[PDB]
Structures are given as C-alpha cells and as structure tokens.
Design an enzyme around this catalytic site. Sequence first.
Site, short mmCIF file in Angstrom:
data_model
loop_
_atom_site.label_atom_id
_atom_site.label_comp_id
_atom_site.label_asym_id
_atom_site.label_seq_id
_atom_site.Cartn_x
_atom_site.Cartn_y
_atom_site.Cartn_z
N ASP A 14 -3.21 38.86 67.15
CA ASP A 14 -2.39 39.66 68.06
C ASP A 14 -2.94 39.92 69.43
OD1 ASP A 14 -0.28 39.87 66.12
OD2 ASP A 14 -1.04 41.78 65.41
N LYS A 17 -3.73 34.95 71.85
CA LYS A 17 -4.20 33.59 71.89
C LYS A 17 -3.09 32.55 72.13
CE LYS A 17 -6.29 33.88 67.91
NZ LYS A 17 -5.75 35.22 67.68
N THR A 18 -1.98 32.72 71.44
CA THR A 18 -0.92 31.76 71.51
C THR A 18 -0.14 31.91 72.81
OG1 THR A 18 -0.89 31.53 69.13
CG2 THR A 18 1.12 30.86 70.25
N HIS A 77 -7.04 33.94 61.26
CA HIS A 77 -8.49 33.98 61.22
C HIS A 77 -9.07 32.88 60.28
CE1 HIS A 77 -12.55 35.37 60.92
NE2 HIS A 77 -12.41 35.61 59.63
N1 LIG Z 1 2.16 43.60 76.72
C1 LIG Z 1 1.64 42.37 76.51
N2 LIG Z 1 1.85 41.80 75.30
C2 LIG Z 1 1.33 40.59 75.06
C3 LIG Z 1 0.56 39.88 76.08
N3 LIG Z 1 0.22 38.70 75.56
C4 LIG Z 1 0.70 38.67 74.31
N4 LIG Z 1 1.39 39.79 74.04
C5 LIG Z 1 2.11 40.12 72.79
O1 LIG Z 1 1.21 40.38 71.72
C6 LIG Z 1 1.73 39.77 70.50
C7 LIG Z 1 0.74 38.78 69.94
O2 LIG Z 1 0.59 37.63 70.81
P1 LIG Z 1 0.06 36.29 70.29
O3 LIG Z 1 -0.08 35.31 71.46
O4 LIG Z 1 0.97 35.80 69.20
O5 LIG Z 1 -1.32 36.71 69.61
P2 LIG Z 1 -2.28 35.75 68.73
O6 LIG Z 1 -2.12 36.37 67.37
O7 LIG Z 1 -3.63 36.10 69.38
O8 LIG Z 1 -1.97 34.32 68.93
C8 LIG Z 1 3.07 39.14 70.87
O9 LIG Z 1 4.15 40.08 70.65
C9 LIG Z 1 2.92 38.91 72.36
O10 LIG Z 1 4.16 38.69 73.10
C10 LIG Z 1 0.38 40.57 77.35
O11 LIG Z 1 -0.27 40.03 78.30
N5 LIG Z 1 0.93 41.79 77.48
MG LIG Z 2 -1.35 32.84 67.54
#
Ligand SMILES: Nc1nc2c(ncn2[C@@H]2O[C@H](COP(=O)(O)OP(=O)(O)O)[C@@H](O)[C@H]2O)c(=O)[nH]1
Ligand SMILES: [Mg+2]
Length: 386
Positions: A14, A17-18, A77
């Site tokens: 969350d 990353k993606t 993870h």
């Molecule tokens: N407010 C905010 N939310 C973000 C940002 N980047 C990602 N998110 C949100 O955080 C959540 C997780 O993002 P994701 O890229 O899937 O995380 P991952 O699990 O690290 O790959 C999603 O709802 C995104 O849209 C950001 O720069 N600002």
């Molecule tokens: Mg991801």
Amino acid sequence: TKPHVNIGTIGHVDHGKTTLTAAITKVLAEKGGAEFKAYDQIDKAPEEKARGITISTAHVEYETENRHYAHVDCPGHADYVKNMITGAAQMDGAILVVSAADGPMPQTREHILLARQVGVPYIVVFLNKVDMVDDPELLELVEMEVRELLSSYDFPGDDIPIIKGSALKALEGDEIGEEAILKLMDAVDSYIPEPERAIDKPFLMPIEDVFSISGRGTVVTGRVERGIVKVGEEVEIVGIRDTQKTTCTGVEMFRKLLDQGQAGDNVGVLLRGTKREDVERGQVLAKPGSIKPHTKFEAEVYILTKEEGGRHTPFFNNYRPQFYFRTTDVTGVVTLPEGVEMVMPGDNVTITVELIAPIAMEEGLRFAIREGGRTVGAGVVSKIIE
Ligand SMILES: Nc1nc2c(ncn2[C@@H]2O[C@H](COP(=O)(O)OP(=O)(O)O)[C@@H](O)[C@H]2O)c(=O)[nH]1
Ligand SMILES: [Mg+2]
C-alpha cells in the site's frame, strides 16, 4: 546503444509501488521512452510458476535519455521474498517506496534487510504520498527515519537519493507530480551504476563432467559462468579438495576448437597434467586467487511450502540437509539465529551452515536446500565465515 539496467520497486504493501511503476512508464511514455502501462495492468501481475514456486511479478520496460531499464513490481511481500532470494528477479538497484504518511513499516525494514542479504547493490528512495503530508518538518523527519533505517542495514543512508512526491498526482498528470518522477529517474540514472559485464569478471566455470580420453588427458565440461578462459593460461581447480593450479591447453565445442571460452559458452576445457581422479563435479575452474573454498557461511533462505513441493513441518536447530551448490549436493548442518526456535515451510530466515566438505564460494552464490533429492529451500550466501 543504451546501457541496460535491471531495477524494481520494493517497500511495504500500500505504499505505492505499483502507482509509482505506472507513473514512471506514463511520464517516460510522454517523453517518447516507453509504452504507458496502466495501474491495473501492472497490479494484476501474471503468476509465473517455475521449479514448483509460483510468483506474481509485473515486468515493465522503459528508457530515459541515458539508459534502458527492465523494471519489476510485485503485489505481495511473499513475491518479493521469493524473487529476491531465488533470483527469479535480479536487481542492479531498487527503488524503495515509503509512504510519507505512514513512515517505514515492517516490510520496509524486511525489504531493505533482504536487499542487503541478497546483494542488491544500491537503493534510491521515493517518499510517496506527500499530498497527504502538509507539514514540511514531518516530511523531513520521515526522511531522516528512512535514512537511519537504511544505514542500520549498512546501506549508505546519508548518500542515498530520496525523492519526495505523489505518484498518484503524477498519474493524474499534475505537473509537480510528474517533475518528481523525472527527478526520481535522474537519480536512478546517476546513482545506480550499470552492473559489471559477466565477461569482465574473473573467470569461473562450474565443472559438470570430467573425462579422461586416450591421447588427450583430462577434459572438464561445463558452462563458463563469467569471464574468459584462454588456451595457455593458468586456472585453479577449487572446491571439495585442496586447490590445484594448472594450465588450460584447450577449449572446445562439438567439432569446434577454440582459443578461448567466454561467459555463456558450454565448452570442454583440457587441463594439462591433471589426473581424472583429482577433478570432480562440484568443483569450479577459476582465475587463480579469485575465489576460495569454504565450509562455513551465512545465508538468507526461503523454505518452500508444502504446495511448492517442500516440507510440511518445521525444522529446528542442527537440521542436516544437503546444499546443492551449482552441480552437486554437500551435506551441512544448519544453526538458527538467536531467538529462532523453528523455521516453518514458507518462512525466510538467515541461517548459518557448516558443510562437510568445502565449496568454492562467495557472497551472492545461490544454492538449493535438498532432502532426499527433493528441493525444500532456496538460498543465497550472505556472508562467508572464517
Ligand atoms: N493519496 C495518495 N495515494 C496514493 C499515492 N500513491 C498511491 N496511492 C494509493 O495508495 C493505494 C496503494 O497503492 P499501490 O500502488 O497499489 O501500493 P503497492 O501496494 O505499494 O503497490 C492505492 O489506493 C493508491 O491509489 C499518492 O501519491 N497519494
Ligand atoms: Mg502493488
């Protein structure tokens, strides 16, 4: 023309990353250096099954002015654990993503520790979700925290580039968002060096088979892992027994005599004076002085689950499996770290191993843990002991 570098996004679930991966491909697509891959395409990463083990990994490619990148990103993870230890994904560097609103979280720590253990040589940090943090001092305090954590795993925390931004705003085409992605990619371009070509490293060739041929002498076969062996040069024979030194008098393939063998070549290598009985599978040929035999090491290991073909019960201190190094099994005894009583299937842990015979080894060498000829673990040597 452009040098190629392998990287990936790591960090806690969350943290973005993606979103960041998608934003990179978008902003570089807009400068004419990639196909934009949307968030859903990257997030719904294909499962790849290899050696019993299923890993979900997204693969994306893009280029800056300077370089071509292959980039990996994984949903969970457990995909990181498995990719990084098994080497199903290699990283010349990693982009560590940390949510500025949450700070470092347990997988932030675990991924840094993994990067250290598996030899990822450089980290660049993207401090994400700054749109959620209005206080500049709080931002700086998170950054300082990330630097301390990186240094606590011996990465150079004071020197690591940390870019602050919002990957989500970049995806929405916010200019300040996009500029952060470009600052990130400039830092990646300048801080993460292109890896050493395999051909430039010291010669190393694991021995797969040995032959004694009438009127030729001793021949060893295998694949040159790195470097170059030339007819007339000296090579060491390392592992299993005392190191020996001799001269390469020939390199060959089916119906082809060669003057040399280079990284990637599957060749037979003729050894001057060497008796068949002094060479065996599991030894390596190497550049003299370049690698030593050892019995004792630390490793980061991933223990397969029941579903992957592995064990279905934990092991304990003094577990005594086989370690398959390159071409052969060597028995060894496992010592668990202080505070770890047992290792369950699906766990990853750092262990100490003492083998019953030496193997030519170095940090970064992968191996399988085997019980009765069945793979129950994958490891990478993290430290040589003594
Ligand atoms: N407010 C905010 N939310 C973000 C940002 N980047 C990602 N998110 C949100 O955080 C959540 C997780 O993002 P994701 O890229 O899937 O995380 P991952 O699990 O690290 O790959 C999603 O709802 C995104 O849209 C950001 O720069 N600002
Ligand atoms: Mg991801």
